[PDB]
Design a protein around this ligand. Sequence first.
Ligand SMILES: NC(=O)c1ccc[n+]([C@@H]2O[C@H](COP(=O)([O-])OP(=O)(O)OC[C@H]3O[C@@H](n4cnc5c(N)ncnc54)[C@H](OP(=O)(O)O)[C@@H]3O)[C@@H](O)[C@H]2O)c1
Ligand SMILES: N[C@H]1N[C@@H](N)[C@@H]2C[C@@H](CN3CC[C@H]4CCCCC43)CC[C@@H]2N1
Length: 186
Amino acid sequence: VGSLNCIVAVSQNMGIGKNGDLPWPPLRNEFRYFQRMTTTSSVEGKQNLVIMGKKTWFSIPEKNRPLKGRINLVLSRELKEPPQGAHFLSRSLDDALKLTEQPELANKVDMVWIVGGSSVYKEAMNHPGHLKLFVTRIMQDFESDTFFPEIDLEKYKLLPEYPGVLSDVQEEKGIKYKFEVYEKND
Ligand SMILES: NC(=O)c1ccc[n+]([C@@H]2O[C@H](COP(=O)([O-])OP(=O)(O)OC[C@H]3O[C@@H](n4cnc5c(N)ncnc54)[C@H](OP(=O)(O)O)[C@@H]3O)[C@@H](O)[C@H]2O)c1
Ligand SMILES: N[C@H]1N[C@@H](N)[C@@H]2C[C@@H](CN3CC[C@H]4CCCCC43)CC[C@@H]2N1
């Protein structure tokens, strides 16, 4: 498997969700970026793996599940099989990664993107080795009930730039946001 990456949209107050949905009104271009990042594979004939916790899967509108063109893995210690529309179920993040290594997912998957939620991020983030964080900074405060964990800037470096990622402040529905890329190697 290729690169291990995390992707998240965060408010100023570090919020990522409120009552099973996003704290802000839907930003279509933000969603378009998330689609593009997570779906594009750096290698022909391969596909990306999207790993998400159970609540994340159920918060995605049904019309949008499973995330098309990607292998959809749901994490849960309570499900007996993958939910309707999902491809794989794992009981922990290491089994999800161990499975990428089964000759089955082997060489079909180039990259694996953690798309949420809190617990999954927190864990990927402390995971050892090379990891990139694609962070959309939502430049305002939004009442949230779920939060993104602290980024340790002694380990994660903000990159000056990245191919395919706009460096300019974006604006939509009068909300300003910016895209950032962080990298770690420990
Ligand atoms: N703004 C954004 O970028 C963004 C990104 C994603 C989600 N969201 C929002 O954030 C919220 C969902 O967040 P969340 O943190 O509550 O949910 P989550 O992490 O998606 O779901 C937590 C459930 O997932 C399973 N799980 C999670 N981590 C696991 C692990 N390491 N091993 C095994 N199972 C694990 C457990 O399922 P069992 O209990 O079944 O064991 C746990 O109850 C929703 O509001 C969603 O709308 C926002
Ligand atoms: N940058 C970025 N990081 C992500 N991981 C994102 C997860 C996406 C998952 N979706 C699509 C529609 C959703 C409704 C409610 C909750 C979650 C939902 C939403 C946009 C994301 N953007």
